[PDB]
């Protein structure tokens, strides 16, 4: 029940080919259960409740940056087998740890303990 | 619209299913093709666990879609 | 204290 | 003959309905009070899913009847 990763990030909405950020800034964190199943959860900072919780298996998805609108920190989660795409934006004021979260997320989604 | 079910052992089992087929039906297919009881059959796809009562199309499960099969430990220390 | 959220943009699966 | 619709949480949504009203009508009421589409919302009474094309009286749904509202997988 340990959290592999955790950082402030909000979700976005993709309609057709346009991605709009959601003001419901949350927290993107990863937790591995005793079942060795990595739990990808997104909790809204508004209430601090876990709004999203999806188990992600190795090579199931890929966490990468979104070089479409350079200005801040935007990442997209693509399910290699889920054929699903999610968009998130980091609420961290400094990117000194942006790469760490990015690297850890991938390492926890494709390289679990 | 068959789907590939990969077990924890790494063994992959393709089972013929329909897009409107329910998750329960899919689990049964695994039982006959492996012998895993429904209680121990935990199908996971699209990053989300397949909740009973849902359909394959619900999780955007297409043909030859790889599904993660999780089995209960049924033990401890 | 906190950074403002990004802005709407076009996304293409390249 | 209103009815209380309890969500996945303690939250309860009472909606004024008539015994002759159909299940579809009830789901729509949820949409107006919440915005959940019929597919996402699932109305279950007495542990039995409310099939469409049926009235509230069909399921013996009286006033102040608590219904189980189940929501499908949100987001992805």
The closest alpha carbon to A26, from A2, A1, A63, A52, belongs to A52
- Domain layout of chain B by residue ranges: 2-71
CATH number at residue A33: 2.30.29.70
Beta carbons of C5 and A10 less than 8 angstroms apart? yes
Asked if B60 and A83 come within 8 Å (Cβ–Cβ), the reply is yes
Count of CB pairs separated by less than 8 Å, A with B: 37
Work out whether the CA dihedral D24, D53, D5, A49 comes out positive or negative.
negative
Give the integer Cα–Cα distance in Å for C14 and D56.
Answer: 51
Strand order across the beta sheet in which B42-45 lies: B12-15, B3-6, B65-70, B42-45, B48-49
d(CA D73, nearest CA chain B) in Å: 8
Phi and psi (nearest 5°) for D70? -115, 130
Beta carbons of A17 and A25 less than 8 angstroms apart? no
| Structural domains in chain A (count) | 1
CB proximity D8 to B under 8 Å: no
Work out whether the CA dihedral A81, B28, A53, B9 comes out positive or negative.
negative
d(CA C3, nearest CA chain A) in Å: 5
CB proximity A60 to D under 8 Å: no
Give the integer Cα–Cα distance in Å for A1 and A19.
Answer: 33
For residue D37, give the 3-state DSSP assignment: coil
Asked if B46 and A37 come within 8 Å (Cβ–Cβ), the reply is no
Looking at domain B2-71, its CATH class is: alpha beta
For B55, the closest chain D residue by CA position comes to D72
For D39, the closest chain B residue by CA position comes to B58
Give the integer Cα–Cα distance in Å for A93 and C4.
Answer: 9
């Amino acid at each position: 029940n340990k959290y592999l990763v955790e950082f402030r990030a909000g979700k976005m909405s993709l309609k057709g080919t346009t991605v709009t950020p959601d003001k419901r800034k949350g927290l993107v964190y990863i937790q591995q259960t005793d079942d060795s199943l990595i739990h990808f959860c997104w909790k809204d900072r508004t209430s601090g409740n876990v709004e999203d919780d999806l188990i992600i298996f190795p090579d199931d998805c890929e966490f990468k940056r979104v070089p479409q609108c350079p200005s801040g920190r935007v990442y997209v989660l693509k399910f290699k087998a889920g054929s699903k795409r999610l968009f998130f934006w980091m609420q961290e004021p400094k990117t000194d740890q942006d790469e760490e979260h990015c690297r850890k997320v991938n390492e926890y989604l494709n390289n679990p303990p | 619209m068959q789907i590939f079910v990969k077990t924890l052992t790494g063994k992959t089992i393709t089972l013929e299913v329909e897009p409107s087929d329910t998750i329960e039906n899919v689990k049964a297919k695994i039982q006959d093709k492996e012998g895993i009881p429904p209680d121990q059959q935990r199908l996971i796809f699209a990053g989300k666990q397949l909740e009973d009562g849902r359909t394959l199309s619900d999780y955007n499960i297409q043909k030859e879609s790889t599904l993660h099969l999780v089995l209960r430990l049924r033990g401890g220390d | 204290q906190e950074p403002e959220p990004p802005e709407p943009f076009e996304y293409i699966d390249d």
